[PDB]
Amino acid sequence: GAYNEWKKALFKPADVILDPKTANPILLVSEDQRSVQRAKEPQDLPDNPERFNAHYCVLGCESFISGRHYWEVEVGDRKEWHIGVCSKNVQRKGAVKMTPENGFWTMGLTDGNKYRTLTEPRTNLKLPKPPKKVGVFLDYETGDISFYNAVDGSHIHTFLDVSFSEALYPVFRILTLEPTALTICPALE
């Protein structure tokens, strides 16, 4: 239907590779760099400038300054996750609040069934069908970051008409210990 036909007509499928150099030491990025899990305890890693040292986040390797791009994320039945995009120059050392003011445009799930945007004030999102796969859509020039249920195509949230002035990375955050990983669909190609 509309979602499938639209994504294919208009957005370039991004091949998102999770970047281990960015990941907080509490995260474990899979071998193929397509999945991330949250570990019990932090790994011993470099404190290189790219690495988030407080927020439990990882970025894709590739950033964008133009165009229409999408990727789909298999969240499955994981009870907590937040995903979206963030500016290249976000504060990576120390924990700043994850909001659009601070360069993050993200939504997600907390506490098993509370869907929300990471904004001030928060928008609580009523999803009586829980998504298992989420499509993330970037239109850099219009400034719209959209989230869809990637199975039934229903719209979840859009951040509308942002004037981006930095490169944008895919971002993924998982706070809790859960058996289901967060998985990037490759769609490639």
Residue 166 to residue 158: CA distance in whole angstroms:
19
Domain count, the chain: 1
CATH number at residue 145: 2.60.120.920
Write 3-10 long-range contacts (CB < 8 A, 24+). 3/135, 3/148, 3/150, 3/152, 3/153, 3/154, 4/153, 7/70, 7/135, 7/137, 10/68
- Asked if residue 42 has a cis previous peptide bond (ω within 30° of 0), the answer is no
Q: Which domain holds residue 153?
A: 1-189
